[PDB]
Symmetry: D2
Subunit: 494 residues, 4 copies
Amino acid sequence: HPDISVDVLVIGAGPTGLGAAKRLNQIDGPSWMIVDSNETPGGLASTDVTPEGFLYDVGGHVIFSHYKYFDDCLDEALPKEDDWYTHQRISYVRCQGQWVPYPFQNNISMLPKEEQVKCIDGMIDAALEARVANTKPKTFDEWIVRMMGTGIADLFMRPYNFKVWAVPTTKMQCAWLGERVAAPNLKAVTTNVILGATFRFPARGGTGGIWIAVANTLPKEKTRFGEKGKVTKVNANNKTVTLQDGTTIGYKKLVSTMAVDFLAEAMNDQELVGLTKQLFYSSTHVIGVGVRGSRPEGDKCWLYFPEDNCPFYRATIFSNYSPYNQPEASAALPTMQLADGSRPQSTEAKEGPYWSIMLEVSESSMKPVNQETILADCIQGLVNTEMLKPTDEIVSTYHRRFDHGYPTPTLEREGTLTQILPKLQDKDIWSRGRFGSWRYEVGNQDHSFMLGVEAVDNIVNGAVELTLNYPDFVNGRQNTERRLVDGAQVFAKS
Amino acid sequence: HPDISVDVLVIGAGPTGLGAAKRLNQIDGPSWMIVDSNETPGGLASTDVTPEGFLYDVGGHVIFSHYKYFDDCLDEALPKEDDWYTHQRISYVRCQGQWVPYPFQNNISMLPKEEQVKCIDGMIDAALEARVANTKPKTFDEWIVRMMGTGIADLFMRPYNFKVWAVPTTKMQCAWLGERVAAPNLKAVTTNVILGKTAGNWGPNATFRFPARGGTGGIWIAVANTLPKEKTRFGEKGKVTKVNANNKTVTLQDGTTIGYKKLVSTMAVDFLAEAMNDQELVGLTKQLFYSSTHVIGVGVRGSRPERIGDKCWLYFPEDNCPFYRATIFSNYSPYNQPEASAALPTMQLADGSRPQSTEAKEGPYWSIMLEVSESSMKPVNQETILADCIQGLVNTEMLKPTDEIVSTYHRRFDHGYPTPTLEREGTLTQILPKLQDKDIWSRGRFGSWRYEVGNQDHSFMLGVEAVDNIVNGAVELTLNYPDFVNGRQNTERRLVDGAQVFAK
Amino acid sequence: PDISVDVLVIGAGPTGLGAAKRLNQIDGPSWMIVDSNETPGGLASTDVTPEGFLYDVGGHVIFSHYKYFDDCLDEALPKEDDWYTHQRISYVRCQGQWVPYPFQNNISMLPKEEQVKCIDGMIDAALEARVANTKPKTFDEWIVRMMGTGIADLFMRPYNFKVWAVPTTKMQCAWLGERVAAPNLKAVTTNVILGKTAGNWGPNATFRFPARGGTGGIWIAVANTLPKEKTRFGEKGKVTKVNANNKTVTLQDGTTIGYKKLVSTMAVDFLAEAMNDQELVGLTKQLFYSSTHVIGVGVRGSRPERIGDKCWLYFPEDNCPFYRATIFSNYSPYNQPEASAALPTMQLADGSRPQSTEAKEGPYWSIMLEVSESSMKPVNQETILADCIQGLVNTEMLKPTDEIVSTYHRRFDHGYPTPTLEREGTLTQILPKLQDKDIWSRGRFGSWRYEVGNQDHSFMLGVEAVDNIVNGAVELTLNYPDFVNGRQNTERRLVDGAQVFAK
Amino acid sequence: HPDISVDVLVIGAGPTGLGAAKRLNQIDGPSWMIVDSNETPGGLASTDVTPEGFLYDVGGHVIFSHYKYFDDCLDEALPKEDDWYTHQRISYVRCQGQWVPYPFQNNISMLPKEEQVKCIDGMIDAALEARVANTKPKTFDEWIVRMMGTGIADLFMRPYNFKVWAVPTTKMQCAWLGERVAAPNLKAVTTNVILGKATFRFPARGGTGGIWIAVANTLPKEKTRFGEKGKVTKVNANNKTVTLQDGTTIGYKKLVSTMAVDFLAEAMNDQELVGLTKQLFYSSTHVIGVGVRGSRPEGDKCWLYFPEDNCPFYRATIFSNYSPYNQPEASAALPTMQLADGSRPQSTEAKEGPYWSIMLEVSESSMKPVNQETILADCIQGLVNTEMLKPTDEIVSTYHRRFDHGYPTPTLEREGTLTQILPKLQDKDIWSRGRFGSWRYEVGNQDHSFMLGVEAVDNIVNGAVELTLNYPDFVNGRQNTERRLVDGAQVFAK
Ligand SMILES: Cc1cc2nc3c(=O)[nH]c(=O)nc-3n(C[C@H](O)[C@H](O)[C@H](O)COP(=O)(O)OP(=O)(O)OC[C@H]3O[C@@H](n4cnc5c(N)ncnc54)[C@H](O)[C@@H]3O)c2cc1C
C-alpha cells in the first residue's frame, strides 16, 4: 500500500498533460493527480524572461485553434477582453532580398521574371504528371515536388525543411502533411503571376501565461509541481511511479506526457529503450535579441528562411505581438553590442523604446551546432537578412537549447511507433504528447492539449482518440461537440 | 408543470431507440424514459409468426457488426452459446438459369462464352477509363459502370437496383456506398474466366450469427429486458401524438405529458414533422423519397432440396419474379419453422393447383422469405403480389410446380427504404439542423433517413452516439461519417467503460 | 482528228506549266499545252490598275518544298536583280494591337484579365492532351486542342470563318498535317511572364518575290522557256468539249485534239460539264467552294511608320470584311508607280472628296485585301470596295485623311476549294472515275485539295502527274501532302541523269 | 581510257543488283553493265543442292510482295501457271509441346490455363500503361514489352529474338518494326482466350534461286559478266574506275554497289570508311538441310519458330511441302546415312523413297558462339526434341553451309553509323544498296532488296525518290502500283 493512490496519474504539465488534467477535473469522476518536475506549468510552451526584461516564448504560439474545447479552456483561463491582442494570421518567406507572402507559390510574382519562368515550367511538369498519377507520394520530397514542382521546391520547401528537420526531405514521410492530393493548382499560381483570418495572443506573460492561467483553475491539492514532482522510476507491472523525494504513487491508469524515450528509461525496460532509440529528433536553439529603437518599417508574424545566409529557419518580431513582451520605453538599458559585433562607444544606459526578435536554430546528429558561436552567427544572419542594420543597438540576448525540440517525421517513425505505443497501451499507459507520442503533426499546442483531453476521454468515457490516430479527420472539421461544460455537468447540478 | 419530467426522452424502441436507452442506462447519470406505441420492443426489427408456426423477419440483410459496443449489448442479452447459430455468408445472383456465386463479376464464367466476351470487353473499357479518371461519379449508375463496365452492369447491378430502390440508378447518389474508388479489378475477373473458376466471398472466416429462437426480434426483446422496467412505457399508453418543440413537451394518446430537456426521436422524421404541427418541416420532409416494402413468407413441406442447399440470401435482377431478394429463412435456425412431427395441411401447390389431400401430414418444413419494393415509379398490386411471388419461385426454380405450400405470409411496410436520391442531402441538411436547434436528436433509419446507417448495428449506434453527444460531448460519427466508422475497428466504446469501473 | 499528241495539258497555270516543264524536260512523248487565256499563269497572274498599281490574287507568299520548283524559277528569272528577299513578317489584328504571329506566343499584348482566360484555357488543353487517345475529327476540334477555348475564340475560330465562309465545325482537319493537336503551354506562359513579343521570322525565315510583273511575272518567264509551237494560248486554246471515250478534246475554233493521256488542270466541275457526263456533274456539284474578292488600294505618301516592314496581316475581328491584308508595296518597289508619277486623289479614306482634283506626285504605297463569299456568308458586290476602305480606317491601317489614288476589285468565282468534312468522300469517287478514262485531273481545282493548291504544290502536281504518266513515279504531293512537306525534296531536278547521259 | 566504259556499273547480281539491272535495261537509256563473282545469279537468294538431290534455299522465300514492279519481273521470268505453286501464308510457334498459330498472342489458349493467366495479366499491365504513354519505345525489348506485356514477351518474342539476332533485345533499336503504335490489342487476345478459338507463290522448279536465274535470263547477255571474270578487287572512287580479278578495268559514271558495304570499304582502300563499317554489327547464319525417307508426317507449307532452348535453330521449314521438285522422286534409291537419334542404320543398301526435307537456320555472333563441329548433330537432335523427327526416321541427305554475313543487325548504333557511311559514298557517286549494301534488315528481304536496286537506278536516271531505302514504313503501308515493267515511257517510244 504505497504513499498515494489515484485512478489516473498524469505525468507532465505541458499542454498535453494540462489537457488531461482539465478533462479529469471536469468529469470529476475518477481520482487523479498531475506531477511535473518544473515548478511552473506549461512545459515547453512556457515563457522565459531575460534579466533585462525581454520575454521569449520557448514553444511558439497557436495561429489557429481546431477545437471549441481548447477555446473554452483558454476563455476560462483568460476571460477579459484585454487579456488578449488580436493579429492577422500571416507569414513571409525571405527569398532573394524579398519578403514573399504566404503561401510562397501564390506570390512568386515578387521574384525576378526569369525565376518565375523556372517556377512555372516546373509546376507545368508537375501538373502534367499529376494528371496521370495513380500512386500516392511515399516521401516528403516526392510530396513537395508533386505539389510545387522542381523550381518552387528548390527555392523554398526543400532547403527550408532541411534547416528545420536536419534530415533531407527524401528521408521523411509525408502522411503527416494531410490527405490533400499532391498536385498543383497551376491556374492559381499563373493567374497571380500574370495579374501581379486572425489569431489571439496573450497581452501579458507571453504564451506560457495561458498555461499558468489554465493550470490555476485546477484544484491545487491534486497537483504536485517542482522538484517534489520529478518522476524517477516507473514500475509498469506494479502500477507504481516513484518520485525523486521517494514518494510512491500507485495508479490504475497512467497518462504519460514525458518523452517516450525518457519513459522507457524510467521503466528500466530495455526492450522499449532499444525501440525508442530508433526514433529520430532534433534539438532546438531559441535565440532572443532585444533591440533599441522602433520596429523596422512590420506585422505580427513568423518569417521563414530557406537561404543559407543565416543559421535560423524561422524568426519573429516578438515585440509586435504585445507591448508587454519587452520593457517600456522609459526603462534605461545600456547597449550590449552592435548588430555588426562591435562593442558600443558608451557604457551609458539610454532609454528605449525597444523591440524584440526571436530565432530558432535546429541541431541533430546530422547537423551539429557550435554552441559557443551560434548566438553571434544568428545576429550576423539578422544583418545579412536585413532584419538588423549593422548599427542597431542590442540591449539583451537570450539563448537556450532544448534537447528534445522537434520529433522528426522520418520514414521509420510509424514503423517504430506501432511497436512502442501498443506495448505501453497493454501496460495501461497512455503515452501521449509532442514527445509522449512523437507525432509532430499533432505536436502544436491545440492538438497536444486535446491529446490529453481525448486520452482521459478514452479512459473514462470510451471515446475514440481521434487526434492521436486521425489528425486529418480532426483538422478537416469544426470540432464543436466536446465542451468544457457537457450535458453531463448540466444534468448533475440539479 | 407536466405529468412526467426526464432529462433525455427517447421516442421509439427500435434498435436506434434501444441504443439510446442502453447507453442512458449504462451512464446512469441523467434521468430518462423510453416510449413506444408498440407493446413489443424492436420496432421494424421484430419477428412475425404465421398461424401455422413460421417465423418471418422484416428483411434479408443479416447482421454484421462494426462496433464492439453492439457486440457487448448482444452478448449481454443472449449470453449462452446455444442462443445463437453461426453460418457462412452465402449468397448468389440468379442470372440466366444459373445461381452465380457472389460477387457476380468474379463468377461470370458460368454464363455463355459470348456473354463473357461482352462483359470482359466492358470491364476493359472501364479499367482504361479508370486509369485516366479525374472525377468522382456523381450518380449511383455512374458508380456501377465505372466499377463493372457496361456488360456486367446490365446483367446485375443496374436491373437489380431498380427492383430494390424502385427508382433508376441514374436518379440516386453514390456517396452512401463509400469512398472506395470506382474502378474494376480486371485481373481478378479475367483470371476466374480463364481458369473457368467459380468462387464466393464466404469461407470459415466470413460468418454471421443469427438468434436461435424468435428470429431477429428476439435479440431486441432480450436487449430491452436488460433495461429497468420502471423506466419504460410501451404499448397504447406510450403512443406519442403531440411534440411541443418550443415547450419541450410530448403528449401521449392517453393524455400523459412528458417534459424533456433533450429529445432523441427515432420515429420517421416526416411523422415527427406532422406531430410538431410545423408546416415548414412538413413541407421539407415531404420532399424526401421512400419506397414501401412487401415481405412475403412461404412455408414448404419436405426436407430441404439440394438445389437450395446451404444458401442464405439470393439476388434477383431478372424480370421473371417480382422480388429482388429471397432468403432461405429455414437455414438460419431450426426454430424458425415447426418441427418435423408437426402436422399441417397443404394449402396449395407451387403452380396454384389444389392439393390431392386436405388432411394434415407431418413435415419436415423449410421456409423462404421474399422482398418486393413499391413506389410511384414501380407500383405493386397488393391483391396479387403473393401469387406472383409464388409464381416467381417456380420461374426461378426455387420451387418445383409440385412443391407443397403449408403457410403464406404477407405484410406491407409503408416506410421500407429511405431512398438515397440525388436530392436527399440537400433536403436533409435543411431538416436536421432545424431539429437540432430545437434540442431534438432525430436519429434512425427514418429518424435521420440515411439508408447507409439504417440497418441494425448502425442504427443501434445512432442512438448510442446521440446520447453520448448529449451527455459526454462525443462526436456523432456514424451519423455524419459512415465511411469512417465502417473502415475501422470500433473498440473504444464498450458496455463497461472506465467511468463505471471507477465508481464501484 | 485535227492534231494528235501523246499527252495533252489543259490549262497553263502553275499546275499545267509544271506538267509542261517536265514533259519538255523528259522530251520523249509528244505534247501540247492549251489555255483559254492568252497570258500564262492562270489565277496566279497579276493585274494592273489604270493608275499603275499591280495586284496579285493572293497574300500567301511562296515557300518552296521542292528543289525542282527552285530550278524552274531560277531558269525563268536567273539574275539576282530579278528577285527581292524579305523576312516572313505577319501580325494578327486584335483589339487595337498588331499581335506578332504566332498569336498564342504574343498574348502579352492583350489585357491581363484576357491573358488569364487564355492561359486557363490552354492549361485545360495541355492536361487533356496528356491523356488524349483520339485524333481530332473536325478543324474546330483541332484548333481547340491546340489553343484552348480562349485563344481559339480570339483568333483561329473567328478568322477561319472569314477565310473559308463556313464554320470550323464543318471542316475536316487532316489537311493541316499529322502534327499532334496539343499546346506548347511552356512557350505560351513563358512569353506572358516575360512580357515578351516574338514573331516567327528572322534572317533565315524568308521568301523571295519577283521584282517585276508581280507573281504572274514568274509564270510568264517560266512559260517562255517552252517551245512556242507546242503551246496554244488565247481564244484559239479554249476547250469546249472533252470526249473521254474517244480521247478527243474540241476547242472553240473547232480544232480537234486527240490525246493518249490527259492532264486536266481546269476546275473539275467545269471538266465534268465539258465531258457531258451527268454522273460526274452530280458528284462535282457536291464539292463546296467559296468565291474570293480581291480589293487593291493605292495610297499617296511615304510608307507609314505604323505599317513598317509588315507583309501579311490577319483580321479575325468583325470591324472589316477582309480576312487578310498585304502591304504589297513592301514586296517590290515596281509594284506601284515611282515617286515622280503624278496621279489625282480619287477619295480620302473616310470617303470624302479631295481638296484638289490636280495630279500630285507620290511616293505611293499599296494595300491588297482578300474577302471571301459563299452561300453561308454573302458579299454585297456593289459596296464591298467601300466597306473594305472603311475597314482600313477601323483597323488603323489608314488615317481618315489618307489619299487614295487607285482602287482595284476583281471577284474570282472559284477562290478556295473548301476542306469540308464531305470533301474526301466525294473526291474519292471522282478521281478514280477520271483516272479510269486516262485523265489526270490535277491542280488547285483540278484535284480540289486546298493544302496542295498554292504555287509550289500545284506546280509539282503537274510535274508528278507527267512523271507518273511517263516514268511510273508516285504522285506523292497529290496523295501524301504530309510526306512531301516534312522532307527535303531534292531528288527531282531540272537536269536529271537521263538528260545528262543523252547529251 | 580504261578497258570498258559504262554510265552505270552494277556490282552484284543478287536480287538488288538484278533489280538495278532490270530497271536500267527497261529504261534503255544510259549504258550499263552488271558484274558478279559467282557464275550463277541470285546471290544469297540462290538454291543449293546436295549430292543426293535435295534442294535448299539459302535466303528463304518471299511470302508477300509489296510492289507491282516486283510482280511484273517474276511474271516475266516465270510466265506459265505451272512454273509456280500457291500455298497459304501461315506460320507456327513451337511452345511447350504445341504448334501455336501465328500471331502467337492470338492463340495462347493452347497453353496451360495458369500460363494464360500470366500472359493476360502482363498484357493488362501493358494495356494500362499504353493508355498514358507519351513516349516512343527506344529499344526492341521496350517495344516487345509495351506490345505484348512481360508474360508473352518471355514465352516467345524475347528468347526467340536472341536466337535469331544473337544479341539481346535490349541492344537493338525498334524503328525497323514499323510505326504501328506499341500497344496490345487486349480485347482480341482475351476474346480468343475466352472463346477457346492470304497466299504466296513458290517456284515449281529450281527453288527460290530459280526465280533469279530466270530473271537474270531476261538481261542482254553481253551486258553481264558473272563468275571469276567479274570478281571486283579494286574500286578507285576518285578515278571512277573498278578493277576486276582478271585485271579488267571498268570505268563508270555512277556505281550501284550491292556487295557488303564493309567489303566495299576494303576494296576502296579507304581507312575512314573501313573504320566506320567495322562499327556495324552482323550475325552469321548456318543453313542446315536434312533429307528424310518416308511420307510427310502429320503438313502446312510454312515456317516454324522455336523460342525454346531444346533446339539450336530459330526457325525451321518442311521445305519438301513447297514443291515436289525440291527433293528426289520416290523411285530414286538412296542409302540411309544415319538415323535421327544418331545411330548407324541396320542396312547399308540403297532403298526407294518417298522423301521429305527439313531446313533449319542457326545464328552465330561474337556474343553467341557456335560449335561448328557439332552444330549439324545438335540440329538433328533438336529436330528429335521438337518431335519433327522420330528417333527412328532415316536421314538420307544432310546439308550444312555457313554464311559469314547472314543478318545485318538492327543495333541501337546502326543508324548513327549508317548516316555517316551512306552520305560519304553518295558524295563519291556510289549507291551502296541492299541487305548488306545498305545494312537495313527491314528492307533486306527479296522484294525490298530488288526494289532498292530499281529505285537507286530510278534515282540516278529519273530523279525518283528512294522510298524503300529511307521510308520502309511508307512503302510497306501502301499498294505500290505506279512503277511497272512497262511504263508510259516505253509505250510512247514504239
Ligand atoms: C483567289 C485565289 C487566291 C490565291 N492566292 C494564292 C496565294 O496567296 N499564294 C499562292 O501560292 N497561291 C495562291 N493561289 C493559287 C495559285 O494561283 C496556284 O498556283 C494556282 O492557281 C493553282 O494551280 P492551277 O494551275 O490549277 O491554277 P489555275 O489558275 O486554275 O489554272 C487553270 C488554267 O486553265 C485554264 N482553263 C480553265 N478552263 C479552261 C477551258 N475550258 N479551256 C481552256 N483553258 C481552260 C484557266 O484559264 C487557267 O489559266 C490563289 C488562287 C486563287 C483562286
